[model samples]
Target: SDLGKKLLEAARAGQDDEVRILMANGADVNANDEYGSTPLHLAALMGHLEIVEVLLKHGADVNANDRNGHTPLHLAAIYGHLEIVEVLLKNGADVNANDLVGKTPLHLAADLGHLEIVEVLLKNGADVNAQDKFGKTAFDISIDNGNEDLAEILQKL
Candidate 1:
């Protein structure tokens, strides 16, 4: 992900030429930075749609995590960047991918009360029943995160 942070910085700075060069030279789009955060993670957090698209097109792993074990989808959900989540999902990102804690992207979205992202992830086949290291399912995590509305919806899934 170290490379990811660099890629993100480049993308955020609008260094399009550098981006193209990296891709052309075999830069691993999914390489994680120090925190295990991928370029997609940074781009999504900053709402850099162009970078997200580029990385996805080049085969970035949407399920990669940082030190907190949060993937690009997790960051997008936390920040309520629903469009980024959708882009990653359309690229075949595993909605049910587990981090070090075994939490799915759906769990992250629900925990953050990301309503639109929840709809997208669910529609993309994110498993509502996926559990975490603490044996908490998305519904349970959503409740723990204090998003009553999301928790309720997750439970109904």
Candidate 2:
């Protein structure tokens, strides 16, 4: 529906008030786009912190996976949204959600050299030894990405 599209656009653009208005008008909080990306996913991916919070408060699925099996947490990790990561985790986002290729948020964070996100994921019970489809653990990804700091942190686990 148009409302759903507007909600997604509002989320991606960080239009907090527009999001609230659309939600107030009964837009589906969990409405997904063609790629199965929900408002929460777009908001989280784009670092729209307030939009993320509003969506969660409206009962958005914290673990809603897109067509590629990437959850809001995965996008948050990949994009290095530290506060959004914390919020999603607190709202029950799966810390170890794997994408289509079996890469968990930890894997993406480590691969992208997101040190703070990696620390947060670890503290929130992410599996340090979880391997992706390529059989590479977050530690391996860190090493391959030349993220020595991440490798050191992931290796200690």
Candidate 3:
């Protein structure tokens, strides 16, 4: 709808004020674009922590996914945005949510060698043995790239 198209665009552009204004003017917090990506997905993809919080306050779906079933947490994990990841987790994002390929946020973080993100995911109770479509766990991904730190943590879990 027109009410939230601008809000989604502004969110993707990282225009905080624009997003806030659009939201204040009654933009739909859960508005989705062509790919089923909500304002929260765009904000989280860009690591806009404030925008994320604003969207959350506006009643955005924290677990909203794109065409690929990638939640806000999935985007944050892929980009290694630790703060965004933290905020999403605190807001109750599904840590084990998967994309179309079945890769969870933990898998993405571990594959990217994001040690801190992996640590945060683990602390939030991410499943160490969760598998993707290929039946590979976070440990399996870490093992491929030799991410010792992440691998160690996954092994210990």
Candidate 4:
């Protein structure tokens, strides 16, 4: 599984060529490390769009979660990668996916004032009224986080 580890490392470092080569040589695209973060998670987290795209084509799971229950889409959303978010959604990443705390990507995007990310999530059918473990909805998070523009968008939902 050394090749798989290399693939993961390559992904985390945003080395598209290394990732592609390792995957072509039979590396496990879904391989995860100690914290359970996969290559897709790494690529998405770092905004490596080509790496994300290649991993997806090589069977990387768009909805696969890390140890904290954060999916690739979650990372993309949190990192404000609109292009990656769009790609992940087009590939069937669940817009309503929740983390360990029951916080969806919408919650993170709204709280961070990532308006376009929130808009994309909404268009893809994210539950604006979804409550986290704290019983707070995206609107609440947006307001609490001082992102009134996002809260306004959630209000219209």
Quote each prediction's TM-score: 0.80, 0.96, 0.95, 0.96
Which regions in candidate 1 have their CA more than 4 angstroms from the true location?
A: 1-8, 12-14, 24-26
lDDT of 1 at 26: 68
**Residue 10 shift from truth in candidate 1, angstroms:** 0.4
Clashing pairs in 3: none
The prediction achieving the highest lDDT against the true structure is: 2
Candidate 2 lDDT, 54-92, residue by residue in tens: 999889999988999999999988888899999999998
Q: For residue 10, what is the lDDT in candidate 3?
A: 94
The candidate, 1 or 2, that scores higher on lDDT is 2
lDDT of 3 by residue, 1-157 (tens): 5878898899989999988788778889999999999999998888888999999877789987799889999999998999999998988798888899999999999988999899899889898888999999989998899878777888882
- Candidate 2 has which clashing residue pairs, if any? none
Q: What RMSD does each model have against the real structure?
A: 3.1, 1.0, 1.3, 1.1
Per-residue lDDT of 55 in model 4: 89
lDDT of 4 by residue, 18-109 (tens): 88789779899999999989999999988888998898888787888899999999988887989999999998899999999999999888
In Å, residue 2's CA in model 3 sits off its true spot by 1.7
Model 2, residue 80: what's the lDDT?
89
